[PDB]
Design a protein around this ligand. Structure first.
Ligand SMILES: CC(=O)N[C@H]1[C@@H](Oc2ccc([N+](=O)[O-])cc2)O[C@H](CO)[C@H](O)[C@@H]1O[C@@H]1O[C@H](CO)[C@H](O)[C@H](O)[C@H]1O
Ligand SMILES: CC(=O)N[C@H]1[C@@H](Oc2ccc([N+](=O)[O-])cc2)O[C@H](CO)[C@H](O)[C@@H]1O[C@@H]1O[C@H](CO)[C@H](O)[C@H](O)[C@H]1O
Length: 135
């Protein structure tokens, strides 16, 4: 099962979200879901073993349909190891860093950031903490 991080004032530039945890043994997937109503503004989905390969899929869900995926092979997650995911919100994109190192960028497709009221956290991880602050 997952956990939901409420974002009362919605997503706003300068917001920094930090997810601390440990990847479960023989992990299959991890998923962060920034939601706007029934839409998923930003889906960050590390897939550990998809067709015998590790890949990170990012996408947006609108009107119950997923859009064009953005993929990358660099994969900084390992089963059973501690991890830290840091997401910085900029006016133009979500900046994702893993273990204090830039990982990727995802340009905003859903533009009304103020409406993105929560962040779903799911997958094969044990959560230590999931919080946010403004920097
Ligand atoms: C392993 C494989 O041949 N994957 C194909 C396949 O993927 C699926 C997945 C689910 C279902 N289904 O629930 O019915 C059918 C097929 O078909 C896809 C297109 O329909 C892709 O061709 C997929 O290959 C993967 O495509 C992605 C990009 O979409 C990427 O290129 C992957 O590297 C590639 O394996
Ligand atoms: C089951 C699976 O492999 N889902 C993939 C797949 O989806 C399909 C759906 C239908 C067919 N088909 O009828 O031949 C092929 C493949 O490929 C999609 C991309 O082309 C997605 O990768 C889909 O997985 C879904 O991806 C979205 C993000 O794009 C999100 O991660 C969903 O949770 C995930 O199921």
């Amino acid at each position: 099962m997952p956990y939901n991080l409420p974002l009362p004032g919605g997503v706003v530039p300068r917001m920094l979200i930090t997810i601390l945890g440990t990847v479960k043994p023989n992990a299959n997937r991890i998923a962060l879901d920034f939601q706007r109503g029934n839409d998923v503004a930003f889906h960050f989905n590390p897939r550990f073993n998809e067709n015998n390969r590790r890949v990170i899929v990012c996408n947006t869900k609108l009107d119950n349909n997923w859009g064009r995926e953005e993929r990358q092979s660099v994969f900084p997650f390992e089963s059973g190891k501690p991890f830290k995911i840091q997401v910085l919100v900029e006016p133009d994109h979500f900046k994702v860093a893993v273990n204090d190192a830039h990982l990727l960028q995802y340009n905003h497709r859903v533009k009304k950031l103020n409406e993105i009221s929560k962040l779903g956290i799911s997958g094969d991880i044990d959560l230590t903490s999931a919080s946010y602050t403004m920097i």
